[PDB]
Each structure stands twice: as structure tokens, then as C-alpha cells.
Amino acid sequence: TRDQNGTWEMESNENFEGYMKALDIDFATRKIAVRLTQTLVIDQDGDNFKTKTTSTFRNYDVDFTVGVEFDEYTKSLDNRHVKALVTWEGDVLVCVQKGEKENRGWKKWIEGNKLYLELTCGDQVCRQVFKKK
Ligand SMILES: *C/C=C(C)/C=C/C=C(C)/C=C/C1=C(C)CCCC1(C)C
DSSP states (O other): OOOOOEEEEEEEEESHHHHHHHTTOOHHHHHHHHTOOOEEEEEEETTEEEEEEEOSSOOEEEEEETTOOEEEEOTTTTOOEEEEEEEEETTEEEEEEESSSTTOEEEEOOBTTEEEEEEEETTEEEEEEEEEO
16 A cells, blocks of 8 residues: 555654764754654645654654655754655655765555654664554
């Protein structure tokens, strides 16, 4: 399925620290963030996505249209400009953020009743799993 609609709660988060270091997020932000349960809420209508990731701490809103290149300024992440593009490879949703960091982006797919999110930067891969609330 390409339907990723839902309120998804984080079950697991592997190597978030390595990914965040590859991004140059400061040590203290990394230390808080690694401990936090995330909730990802995806509103998907055709090609249009509206995403909100929420935690007790900081939140990140990301909206995009599949197949439509978009500028991003990653404020209160690593504060960089990237050229982002989200497309489908079969039922994997693939984001590539072109810019200063090598191999930036994330692969979003679907397996059984879970959402899998694989965040990449440089040589680092962070693997997250979410279940519907
Ligand atoms: C498809 C959903 C995506 C790509 C969600 C991405 C969320 C982030 C890149 C946010 C990461 C965060 C940190 C690295 C530090 C704490 C703040 C967060 C949780 C927004």
C-alpha cells in the first residue's frame, strides 16, 4: 500500500544518535531527543502530504507534494538549505534532500500494521518503526 495515512506512534528508534551527529545536531539536543517518544501524524490526500512529528519536546511540521521539488530550510534541526524531492519507488516513499550533506533523505514504506522510516545522512542510517494509535 501507498496509503500512509494515520496517527503513528513510535515503537522503536535505532541509531537516532548516529544520524543526528551526521547532521551536526548539538550534543544536548541529541541527548534529549534520543529519549523521546515520537508521534507522527500523516494526512495524505492523493499526492499531497501534510506531516506533523510531535514529542513532549520539539515538533517538526513538513508538508509536500509527491513529485514536486521543494526548497527546505531545516530550521531547529540543522539549519541548512536543501532541495527536497519525494517520490514513489513501488510502495516505498523516498525523499532525497540535495545539499551539503551526502546521502540525505529517508525511505518510507509499509509492512503489515507498521510504518517503517529509514533516515539517512552521510554514512549513517537510523531505523524507526511506528504502529497506528
Ligand atoms: C516522513 C517523515 C519525516 C521525514 C519526519 C522527519 C522528522 C524529522 C527529520 C525530525 C527530527 C527531529 C530531530 C532530529 C531532533 C528533535 C526534533 C525532531 C524530532 C523533529
